[PDB]
Write a protein that binds this DNA or RNA. Sequence first.
DNA 1: CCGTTTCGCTCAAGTTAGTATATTAAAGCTGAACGAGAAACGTAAAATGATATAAATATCAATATATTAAATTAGATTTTGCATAAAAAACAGACTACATAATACTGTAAAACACAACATATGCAGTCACTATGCCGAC
Length: 89
Amino acid sequence: GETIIASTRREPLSSGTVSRYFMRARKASGLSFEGDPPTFHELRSLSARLYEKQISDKFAQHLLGHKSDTMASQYRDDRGREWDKIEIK
DNA sequence: CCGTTTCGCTCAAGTTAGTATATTAAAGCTGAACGAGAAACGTAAAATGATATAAATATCAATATATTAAATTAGATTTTGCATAAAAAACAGACTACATAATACTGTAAAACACAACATATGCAGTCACTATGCCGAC
């Protein structure tokens, strides 16, 4: 299609539908979280979380389009999901 | 071919993610009104093109010889650029003399208002009428 992410009709797809079809597989996958379950937007958080350990921190700060140095530590939090494993370093 | 149900869409109310400015200071942009000198135009007048023919005047080569305007000097001199310096007049730097304001001090009338006993119109105090439909009563 004309867009990198099109539909089954070779036509663009709204942003308020790409996440909808993502929630279905979420509940169908049979998961279990604390409080409000994740979402499609969380893919941006997981991407940066991996881009911080794979390469560096200065890399997962420009790719996301961020410039400030206040949310670089807030978008790195875990909120109480997986314990921040502290290695020898 | 047509009807029925699911699915792609957008409206409506909650749930999150991101970035952070106000005054000074000094311009810069652009619509609209303001104020002369030179040349292209144009009608009118002056000079010239038009036009031709026998007779009058100029066209010109090739060289001797007297004549002359005038650039080319070459020396003479007013003209022109530039100060130098003193006689002569302007003008601060002094100073007493002279008429004039700010001030020193005496001399005198009178403005400006409290104080006090009366005098009394006038606003305030107290009651009834003027002027005309309410309220209450019938229709």
